[PDB]
Amino acid sequence: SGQADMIVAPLTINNERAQYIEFSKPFKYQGLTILVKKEIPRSTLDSFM
Amino acid sequence: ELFFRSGFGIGMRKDSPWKQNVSLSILKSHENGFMEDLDKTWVRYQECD
Amino acid sequence: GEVVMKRAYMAVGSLTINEERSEVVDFSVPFIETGISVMVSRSNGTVSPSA
Ligand SMILES: N[C@@H](CCC(=O)O)C(=O)O
């Protein structure tokens, strides 16, 4: 739309995006992962019995 | 494990008189260790197992 | 060299994207992230000293 001359942000290089706008060479090679909660160790030993 | 490994690029429009010079300065900074410095000061903090 | 001298259209292979080469031959979108690494033999870690 012309409101921005550039996009200085974490924009991944997609085929759909690359068809309309152009991208520079990557400044950050990355990928997709999963974020999960750290498992705090805690015994389930209810009692000595 | 990583998937869809596509990095981050500076997006500009198709015309982009800065297209060639932007990507070279990204490549040059990669070989100059400039992005390695920015990796340390903004990303690589650790201080947690 | 065989793309600069118009001896072939493309140079597929394990070519690395460099600033110097990009000034003479224009590359494409990288399909493999690369860089520099250092190969050293195994060193082990044994066990913690306060088990
Ligand atoms: N992979 C490099 C050459 C091998 C090296 O790193 O020395 C290149 O495409 O030019």
Is A42 annotated to bind a ligand? Reply is no
Only one residue has tokens 């009692």, namely A47
Q: Find chains touching chain A: ≥3 CB pairs under 8 Å.
A: B, C
Which ligand 1 atom is at minimum distance from the Cα of C15? 9
Which ligand 1 atom is at minimum distance from the Cα of C18? 10
Dist. CA B20–CA B2, nearest whole Å: 30
Q: Given CA atoms C21, C23, C26, C28 in this order, what sign does their dihedral have?
A: positive
Please name the method used to determine this structure. Answer: cryo-EM
Task: Please indicate if any CB of chain B lies within 8 Å of the CB of A31.
Answer: yes
- Measured between beta carbons, the chain C residues lying within 8 angstroms of B5 are 33
Report yes or no: C11 and C32 within 8 Å, Cβ to Cβ: no
Only one residue has tokens 């066990």, namely C47
Residue B26 CA: distances (Å) to CA of A24, A27, B8: 8, 6, 11
Dist. CA C34–CA C36, nearest whole Å: 7
Dist. CA A20–CA A14, nearest whole Å: 10
